[PDB]
Amino acid sequence: IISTDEIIECLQNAKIQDIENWKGNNLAIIKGLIRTYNEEKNRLVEFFEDNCVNSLYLVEKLKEIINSGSITVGKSVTSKFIRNNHPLTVETYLKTKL
């Protein structure tokens, strides 16, 4: 599994001014956390509470990222979300789910 420090440090080094420059595992982590926030906001809230000490900073950063509107979201498409996406996205989504 990808360690839980990598996700919070990727959210910490995520830049609002670099929304169009997100390439690599950072975009996959961002897609996973925005899927978690779109599907289970409360589970993400206690995940950031138990995994980070600056939870309000992460919450307002996620709110600022989702208010940009320059990235795409995903609905319930059964296994197609597994099919046409990076596996890092689905493992960081399922790690923040259960």
Side-chain angles (χ1 to χ4, degrees), residues 1 13 21 28 31-32 35 38 47 50 55 76 87 89 91 96:
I1 193 66
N13 58 66
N21 284 334
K31 284 297 214 328
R35 260 308 297 265
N38 281 335
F47 167 73
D50 209 12
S55 299
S76 197
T89 305
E91 64 89 23
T96 57

Side-chain angles (χ1 to χ4, degrees), residues 10 57 63 67 75 88:
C10 167
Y57 191 34
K63 196 67 172 85
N67 279 341
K75 272 287 268 184
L88 195 150

Side-chain angles (χ1 to χ4, degrees), residues 4-5 8 42-55 58 95:
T4 180
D5 311 315
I8 48 172
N42 44 6
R43 304 260 274 279
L44 186 150
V45 159
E46 288 91 7
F47 167 73
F48 281 164
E49 186 178 2
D50 209 12
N51 267 271
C52 189
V53 288
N54 219 0
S55 299
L58 294 198
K95 209 262 175 191

Side-chain angles (χ1 to χ4, degrees), residues 28-91:
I29 287 170
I30 279 156
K31 284 297 214 328
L33 61 95
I34 201 176
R35 260 308 297 265
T36 313
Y37 177 67
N38 281 335
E39 294 319 294
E40 272 87 24
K41 168 170 49 73
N42 44 6
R43 304 260 274 279
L44 186 150
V45 159
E46 288 91 7
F47 167 73
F48 281 164
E49 186 178 2
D50 209 12
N51 267 271
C52 189
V53 288
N54 219 0
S55 299
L56 286 171
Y57 191 34
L58 294 198
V59 162
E60 68 92 20
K61 212 155 197 173
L62 157 69
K63 196 67 172 85
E64 279 166 350
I65 291 306
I66 205 165
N67 279 341
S68 70
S70 192
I71 59 173
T72 51
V73 304
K75 272 287 268 184
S76 197
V77 285
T78 72
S79 298
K80 288 186 285 293
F81 190 77
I82 313 296
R83 192 57 190 164
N84 47 49
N85 284 300
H86 210 263
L88 195 150
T89 305
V90 304
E91 64 89 23

